[PDB]
Design an enzyme around this catalytic site. Structure first.
Site, PDB file in Angstrom:
ATOM      1  N   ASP A 101      34.915  43.481  40.762  1.00  0.00           N
ATOM      2  CA  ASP A 101      35.923  42.539  40.569  1.00  0.00           C
ATOM      3  C   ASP A 101      35.525  41.345  40.038  1.00  0.00           C
ATOM      4  O   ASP A 101      36.117  40.172  39.765  1.00  0.00           O
ATOM      5  CB  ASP A 101      36.658  42.298  41.639  1.00  0.00           C
ATOM      6  CG  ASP A 101      37.957  43.086  42.123  1.00  0.00           C
ATOM      7  OD1 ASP A 101      39.124  43.143  41.448  1.00  0.00           O
ATOM      8  OD2 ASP A 101      37.763  43.923  43.105  1.00  0.00           O
ATOM      9  N   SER A 102      34.389  41.008  39.415  1.00  0.00           N
ATOM     10  CA  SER A 102      33.877  40.143  38.633  1.00  0.00           C
ATOM     11  C   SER A 102      34.145  40.300  37.184  1.00  0.00           C
ATOM     12  O   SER A 102      34.597  41.549  36.683  1.00  0.00           O
ATOM     13  CB  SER A 102      32.284  40.075  38.870  1.00  0.00           C
ATOM     14  OG  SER A 102      31.920  40.252  40.124  1.00  0.00           O
TER      15      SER A 102
END
Ligand SMILES: [Mg+2]
Ligand SMILES: [Zn+2]
Lengths: 158, 359, 80, 379, 76, 49, 50, 50, 49, 338
Positions: free
Chosen positions: J65-66
């Site tokens: 989720d970066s």
């Protein structure tokens, strides 16, 4: 006595409306006051009475600033703005008619809002089916299509 | 040599006034019937006999590593006492003004924005309202007059007094970005037809990038605002300045190489086990351009190298180039100096070709 | 609150033609909308409004980012 | 109750000298490292007691003071038995023995990293601090392979970080609570960390026999570039010509020869449900490592994945210690990411789109299912 | 482990299906893929399943907290 | 006897008798519909229960 | 108190509109339905659509 | 009212994008918020006095 | 270990000597000029030799 | 997830924002109509931008989720805006007043505080205020005890507005408004309209960003691994449709349950000169080397969620307020210790 009056009126949105109307009309400097003298002058022009004069009598809304343009109402943006300020003042002053004038101006402002919403459109476009010159309805959705029983069982019922 | 920087195509971006809507809008907005004083220019350059590292480093420099000029507001330039508008905040107007593309030769120019809306309509502020207050009078404008800086509510004013010209590079603040990427391709690598289903998932080139070494490149870069008459001069100046920037940055690390015998914090040398010498070069605030150029030319000069590589880790903000070779410290230093000289020669040839190709 | 001075993605000066684009788009849209109300334009299933030729005539290149930011950015004065 | 005296004040406690921030990924950090913003490093302090052996080392911290990093904030003078501000000690020149200096947090310091809810024995771990000197970074950066210890992800998660300042706590942090002790799960008795997402796909792409472009090989320059960020001593490529071709198995063996292990297991890539379709390469469906040399097969979740019992990292930890396992995880992750830096990896809408013939086949299958349901209804 | 229950009315799963419907679609069988797109009843059934997932995820934390605290205090 | 809280935009609100321009100039959101209460400085929405 | 209210959080205009269209479950102190009903009331009910 | 015969209604050219017009008409009728201001006005005018 | 240790103590003594010089250059010779020494002594790295 | 995230999205939170003194309100300067819009945007102003998104692996910096963000995109104003904080202070009784305390007025002057920049007891509008600065000076009853309030926040602010209104009890009080310049920072949460949250983990310069053969580069780089388990195919379809929308200069409707055909849209991509998929030949920005695989890159509407790391981060030293009862530190960042 004057301090509470000043803090109550300078933070009244009616004061800001009348002040910007006066700035448009040029009756007060376009900048916010930098000295107490010009702040008092702005208060005198916007409110229509000096802070000491206000504390004497009771009437407040009668002397609020009115536009010097005299915008014959009966190009469009200026008329809308000035009529809106005039109707705001008349509502505060409890004018005789008001309501009918408010309804008429609300109709005109609805028309002007129609024009502004026209200005706000960014274009839509619809993907068309080449066969049917309408919105594309072709999909890959599932169709029931009841199948012959031979697809599940052989000639021996297995 | 042999004209490494081959033919270059220059194509400015112009307004097509044959479009009725565009013509009418320009006429009734700015009374504009001709091209703007500053136009974007698309420069497509063919390079032959040069490594991909050098061409991409030139592209990166022209993008965000060449010094460039911006319009900026000095502290206190935004007149809080006079800016009565409540929506045109200093941050917003500063962002709009910072990114207006300016082609400025003199950095002493100072502009002022004095927009007073004494009408009942919302008034848009254009870059044509940016009046010059300091520096020599502009014989030619440094920015286009059609930018919308902001809008003023009725009875509101916006006063900014210290709009000056600031210098910087793109990698620090993006408003110093000069060239936007338009095209990049290798003309010596064959391409697949990517319109078919068998090749639509592949890049298109018929060689893997892990094994290919292209030497023929086409680079397309667009510059945002150059004067309409002096387009060739502006492009030539930009390309030359990029070459000078690369040459100077390479010479900066060359000066470290000349003092390998003297203790230098940037350069560290070891002799590990098997006659091998390890050289580590750490340059602070150095990007992938210099590291890639150094690795490419060191590897070209020493094909039998034990190991050469670099790391521009996003944190620690430095470039660390590591060279390991079966040699001694002196011979390694001579080889690295030769690689540096090769880089300098290549970019000086590029500068000469820029001079003799864009007139 | 305005079309950005430059493209957010690549920094191309799309704001040079932002005002001209906005005006020309309004004029062009007025010639494609029929009886539908202006606020119902995004709901008209028969509308086919293409701005490709307008943007090309402006001199803006065929860049996804630049045309996207030119045609999609909201103008504050049109909502306030 | 939870807000009552016992649970809120006795069983737990509010503490000083602690920081909290959002966590984001940083693939350039080791698994036992944490990225600490510098502004937090000048807020939390380590208490170093000035003695004869550390006076020379601690003097630069005293000289920097509160103006430059790494500096100090307070000094506890033993003679006065009280704390002194660094800006009032401009006349002290040096530090006395027995003085206590509160210096800034520096790279290499140990810190306790914690993510709530703390449910596992690894929910609190000790990482070596890497101070991020960029003033615009405010997050706690960590390697994505370290997230398995905390069950963390980089979508808004916040973690607590406190630096031990006392000597006993620091000794314990570096001797007892370091995340190398939590590489093997106390729960499952297996490895916790490994390759995740991009690293697993990158290992598969690097170790596969063939690409769509032919044999999966790279030249010497790109083989060297795979080891640029491994943070290990690079292997020797002097016996390779610039035109020589190296397959991914060769560079993986170059990396894994440092910790030679024996591995023999079918990869996750080979699935029997996929076998009737596709054409599996025979060299990709039997992963074998002999004494650190990758002979055949691809590396994927079964061999290098996080939590993979019997994987290569579990064997490395068994034969050489979990610190070697974490170092190998970082090195192989760097190798895979550097390979993907050239190979490229993406997903598109067309990746999930059936052909019209395949769509008709799917429709026929669902029609058969609904026909069986209709036969049951008719019954 | 069971299909969609007829909770809309007596013998009805949704307003979109008749009472005592025998088709599989009326009881939660989704014939369409995600890439093909779901119809309104298919999306409603999928939303029921997803809401079940969300509820289970939400109350998993609380139930695990209760059980974990009890076990810790029993075993510490 | 006392005062009673007035929903914003209701018939008892002052913005009910003002145009969009007048609402704009007195610091009101011209495009907002209202439907909330101004109590002790904050804005409060009475939801559907 | 049978008034379901919340602070007008002006994160955006969508937040305000959604706050004005929010339907809240009734809260009662004595029971509050802390049984299997807890996850029954949080489900998407078949009467919801539309 | 005697509506026309359903067999003569032309609807084959009606698209799913045309039903967005019906949704827009429904939203215009509701106003998306109008119920709460209507209910408060009703309370003020008749509710509290009664 | 020893060579890395010897260079370590040499470096610490050099840094200590340089910063002890720098504090003295605050009272003796003012800050504004001393803050100009550090300014252009850092962009050549140094600041600590 | 999108229903939740679409309501936390930064944008034009109020059209009368300059007239209000609101706490923790973010006004995002630039907002775009999505290239693939829906019926909801006919009634609420859209919040977010049509960011160019490349779905690829870039150095392992977008894992779990970066997202990798373009530093240039941040600098140009992408998701940039103003954060507003209010400071309302009231005079307790007649024994307190607004003014600048002096050494004789001390009795408790805050250690390390500034007490400068105070004009008539208030910091003037347009003044930068740092952590130790004293904003609004108030003295009670030496002959006076200091009751001034300090800034305290780690992030510096600018005094945007200050007033002296009367309260409900007919008394004057404070209400200073503080303005924060909030560009997109590392650790700021971002999301697409399909519920895919993303924390900005890395900001890259323009030269370091990957670019296509035609020069297209992304604002965001999103890990492809966020797609399979989540099955947010609407985001992929929106990217594919917006790729053709941008080249066609159109704003297509993508409302749910509208007739959709991914194959026909992919064919529509081919008629704009692009590949059947949205994949293009891209080059590594740092090395100039092309990827072996064509990368799916295109415009995807993204929303900046109002979860600012500058507001969430907190670090405390060994000192600060303690509870009088337990002697333990106070609770959280708000109490300035804990
Ligand atoms: Mg999370
Ligand atoms: Zn662009």
């Amino acid at each position: 006595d004057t301090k509470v009056l000043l803090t109550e009126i300078l933070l009244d949105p009616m004061y800001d409306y009348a002040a910007t109307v006066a700035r448009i009309d040029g009756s007060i400097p376009m900048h916010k006051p930098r000295t107490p003298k010009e702040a008092e002058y702005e208060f005198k022009t916007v409110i229509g009475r000096t802070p000491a004069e206000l504390l004497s009598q009771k009437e407040f809304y009668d002397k609020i600033y009115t536009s010097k343009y005299r915008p014959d109402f009966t190009k469009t943006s200026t008329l809308i703005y000035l009529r809106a300020y005039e109707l705001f003042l008349k509502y505060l002053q409890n004018a005789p008619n008001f309501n009918s004038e408010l309804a008429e101006f609300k109709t005109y402002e609805n028309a002007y809002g129609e024009q502004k919403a026209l200005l706000a459109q960014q274009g839509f476009y619809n993907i068309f089916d080449p066969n049917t010159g309408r919105a594309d309805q072709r999909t890959r959705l599932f169709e029931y299509k009841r199948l012959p029983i031979s697809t599940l069982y052989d000639e021996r019922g297995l | 040599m042999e004209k490494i920087f081959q033919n270059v195509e220059i194509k400015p971006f112009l307004i097509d006034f044959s479009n009725l809507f565009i013509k009418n809008a320009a006429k009734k907005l700015f009374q504009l019937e001709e091209q703007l004083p500053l136009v974007p220019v698309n420069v497509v350059m063919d390079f032959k006999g040069i490594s991909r590292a050098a061409v991409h480093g030139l592209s990166r420099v022209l993008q965000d590593e060449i010094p460039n000029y911006m319009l900026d507001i000095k502290p206190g330039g935004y007149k809080i006492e006079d800016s009565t508008d409540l929506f045109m905040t200093e941050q917003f107007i500063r962002n709009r003004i910072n990114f207006i593309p300016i082609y400025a030769k003199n950095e002493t120019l100072v502009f002022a924005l004095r927009s007073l809306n004494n009408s009942c309509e919302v008034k848009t502020i254009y870059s044509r309202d940016l009046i010059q207050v300091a520096g020599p009078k502009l014989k030619y404008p440094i920015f286009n007059p059609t930018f919308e800086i902001g809008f003023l509510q009725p009875g509101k004013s916006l006063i900014i007094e210290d709009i000056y010209i600031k210098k910087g590079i793109g990698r620090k603040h993006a408003a110093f970005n000069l060239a936007v990427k338009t095209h990049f391709s290798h003309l010596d690598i064959e391409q697949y037809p990517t319109d078919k289903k068998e090749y639509m998932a592949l890049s298109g080139y018929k060689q893997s990038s892990m094994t290919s070494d292209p030497r023929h490149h086409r680079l397309g870069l667009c510059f945002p605002a150059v004067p309409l008459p002096h387009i060739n001069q502006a492009v030539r100046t930009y390309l030359k300045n990029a070459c000078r920037i690369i040459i100077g940055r390479i010479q900066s690390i060359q000066k470290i190489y000349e003092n390998f015998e003297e203790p230098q914090p940037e350069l560290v040398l070891f002799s590990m086990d098997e006659e091998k010498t390890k050289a580590i070069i750490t340059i602070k605030d150095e990007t992938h351009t210099i590291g890639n150029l150094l690795k490419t030319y060191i590897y070209e000069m020493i094909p039998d190298i034990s190991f050469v590589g670099y790391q521009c880790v996003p944190h620690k903000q430095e470039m660390v180039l590591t060279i390991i070779h079966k040699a001694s410290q002196e011979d390694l230093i001579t080889l690295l100096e030769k690689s540096i000289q090769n880089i300098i020669q290549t970019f000086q040839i590029l500068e000469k070709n820029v001079d003799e190709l864009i007139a | 609150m305005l079309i950005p001075v430059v493209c957010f993605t690549c920094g191309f000066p799309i704001g040079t033609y932002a005002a001209i684009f906005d005006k020309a788009r309004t004029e062009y849209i007025k010639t494609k909308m029929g009886g539908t109300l202006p606020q119902n334009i995004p709901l008209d299933a028969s509308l086919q409004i293409e701005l490709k030729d307008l943007i090309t005539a402006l001199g803006i290149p065929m860049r996804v980012c630049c045309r996207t930011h030119l045609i999609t950015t909201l103008d504050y004065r049109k909502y306030y | 109750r939870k807000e009552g005296r016992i649970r809120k004040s006795l069983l737990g406690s509010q503490v000083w000298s602690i920081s909290r921030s959002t966590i984001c990924g940083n693939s350039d950090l080791h698994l036992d490292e944490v990225g600490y913003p510098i502004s937090f490093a000048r807020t939390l302090q380590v208490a170093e007691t000035v003695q004869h052996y550390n006076i020379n080392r601690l003097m630069p911290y005293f000289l920097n003071g509160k103006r430059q990093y790494p500096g100090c904030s307070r000094v506890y003078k033993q003679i006065t038995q009280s704390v002194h501000d660094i800006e009032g000690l401009k006349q002290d020149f040096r530090l006395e023995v027995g003085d206590i200096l509160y210096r800034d947090v520096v790279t290499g310091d140990v810190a306790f990293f914690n993510r709530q809810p703390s449910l596992e024995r690894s929910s609190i771990g000790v990482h070596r601090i890497v101070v991020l000197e960029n003033p615009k970074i405010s997050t706690f950066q960590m390697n994505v392979s370290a997230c398995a210890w905390y069950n963390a992800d980089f979508d808004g998660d916040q973690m607590n970080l406190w630096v031990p300042w006392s000597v006993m706590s620091r000794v314990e942090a570096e001797l007892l609570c370091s995340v190398r002790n939590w590489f093997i799960s106390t729960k499952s008795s297996g490895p916790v960390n490994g390759q995740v997402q991009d690293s697993t796909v990158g290992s598969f792409l690097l170790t596969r026999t063939n690409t769509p472009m032919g044999k999966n090989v790279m030249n010497k320059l790109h083989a060297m570039g795979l080891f640029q960020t491994t943070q290990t001593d690079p292997p020797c490529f002097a016996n390779y010509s610039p035109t020589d071709l190296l397959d991914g198995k060769s560079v993986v063996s170059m990396l894994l020869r440092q910790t030679p292990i024996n591995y023999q297991r079918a990869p996750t890539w080979y699935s029997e449900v996929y076998a009737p379709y596709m054409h599996y390469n025979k060299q990709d469906i039997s992963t074998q490592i002999r004494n650190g040399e990758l002979i055949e097969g691809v590396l994927d979740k079964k061999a290098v994945g996080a939590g993979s019992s019997g994987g290569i990292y579990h064997l490395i930890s068994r034969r050489y210690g979990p610190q070697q396992a974490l170092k190998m995880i970082f090195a192989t992750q760097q190798l895979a990411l550097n390979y993907v830096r050239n190979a490229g990896f993406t997903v598109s809408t067309a990746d999930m789109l059936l052909t019209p013939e395949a769509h008709q086949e799917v429709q026929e299958i669902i029609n058969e299912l609904l026909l069986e349901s209709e036969e049951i209804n008719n019954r | 482990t069971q299909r969609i229950q007829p909770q809309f009315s007596f013998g009805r799963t949704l307003v979109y299906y008749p009472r005592f419907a025998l088709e599989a679609q009326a009881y939660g069988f989704i014939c369409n893929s995600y890439i093909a797109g779901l119809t309104s009843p298919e999306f409603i059934f999928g939303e029921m399943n997803g809401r079940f997932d969300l509820i289970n995820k939400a109350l998993s934390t609380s139930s695990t907290g209760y059980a974990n605290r009890k076990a810790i205090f029993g075993l510490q | 006897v006392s005062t009673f809280p007035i929903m914003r935009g209701s018939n008892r609100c002052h913005t009910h008798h003002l145009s969009k321009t007048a609402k704009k100039e007195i610091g009101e959101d011209p495009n907002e519909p209202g439907g909330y209460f101004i109590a002790r400085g904050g804005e409060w929405v009475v939801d559907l229960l | 108190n049978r008034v379901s209210t919340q602070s007008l959080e002006r994160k955006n205009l969508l937040n305000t509109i959604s706050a004005l269209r929010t339907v809240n479950t009734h809260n009662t102190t004595n029971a509050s339905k802390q049984t299997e009903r807890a996850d029954m009331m949080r489900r998407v009910h078949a009467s919801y659509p539309g | 009212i005697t509506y026309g015969p359903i067999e003569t209604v032309d609807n084959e050219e009606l698209t799913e994008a045309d039903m967005l017009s019906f949704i827009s008409a429904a939203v215009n009728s509701t106003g998306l918020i109008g119920y709460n201001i209507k209910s408060f006005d009703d309370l003020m005018d008749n509710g509290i006095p009664q | 270990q020893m060579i890395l240790q010897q260079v370590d103590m040499k470096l610490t003594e050099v840094i200590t000597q340089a910063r002890q010089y720098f504090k003295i250059m605050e009272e003796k010779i003012g800050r504004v000029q001393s803050d100009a020494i550090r300014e252009i002594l850092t962009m050549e790295g140094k600041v600590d030799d | 997830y999108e229903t939740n995230q679409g309501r936390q999205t930064g944008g034009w939170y109020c059209f009368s924002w300059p007239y209000r003194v609101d706490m923790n309100r973010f006004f995002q300067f630039y907002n775009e109509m999505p290239l693939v819009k829906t019926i909801a945007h006919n009634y609420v102003i859209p919040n977010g931008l049509n960011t160019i998104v490349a779905y690829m692996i870039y150095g392992g910096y977008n894992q779990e989720d970066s997202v990798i963000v373009s530093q240039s995109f941040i600098d140009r104003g992408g998701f940039a805006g103003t954060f507003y904080r209010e400071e309302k202070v009231e005079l307790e009784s007649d024994i307190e007043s607004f003014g600048k305390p002096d050494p004789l007025i001390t009795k408790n002057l805050k250690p390390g505080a500034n007490y400068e920049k105070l004009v008539d007891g208030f910091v003037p509008v347009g003044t930068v205020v740092k952590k130790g600065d004293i904003i609004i000076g108030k003295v009670a009853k030496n002959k006076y005890i200091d009751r001034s309030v300090m800034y305290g926040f780690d992030e510096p602010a600018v005094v945007d507005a200050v007033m002296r209104p009367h309260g409900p009890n007919d008394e004057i009080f404070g209400l200073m408004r503080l303005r924060y310049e909030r560009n997109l920072n590392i650790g700021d949460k971002m999301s697409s309209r399909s519920g895919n949250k993303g924390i900005a983990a890395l900001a890259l310069p323009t030269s370091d960003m990957p670019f296509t053969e035609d020069g297209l580069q992304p604002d965001l780089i999103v890990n492809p691994h966020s797609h399979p388990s989540r099955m947010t195919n609407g985001q992929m379809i929106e990217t594919t449709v917006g790729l053709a929308n941008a080249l066609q200069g159109v704003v297509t409707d993508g409302t749910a349950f509208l007739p959709i055909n991914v194959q026909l849209l992919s064919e529509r991509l081919a008629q704009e000169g692009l590949r059947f998929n949205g994949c293009q030949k891209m080059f590594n920005g740092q090395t100039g080397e092309y990827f072996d695989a064509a990368i799916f890159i295109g415009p995807t509407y993204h929303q900046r969620l109002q979860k600012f790391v500058l507001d969430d981060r907190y670090a405390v030293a060994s000192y600060g307020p303690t509870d009088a009862l337990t002697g333990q530190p106070l609770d959280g960042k708000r109490s300035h210790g804990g």
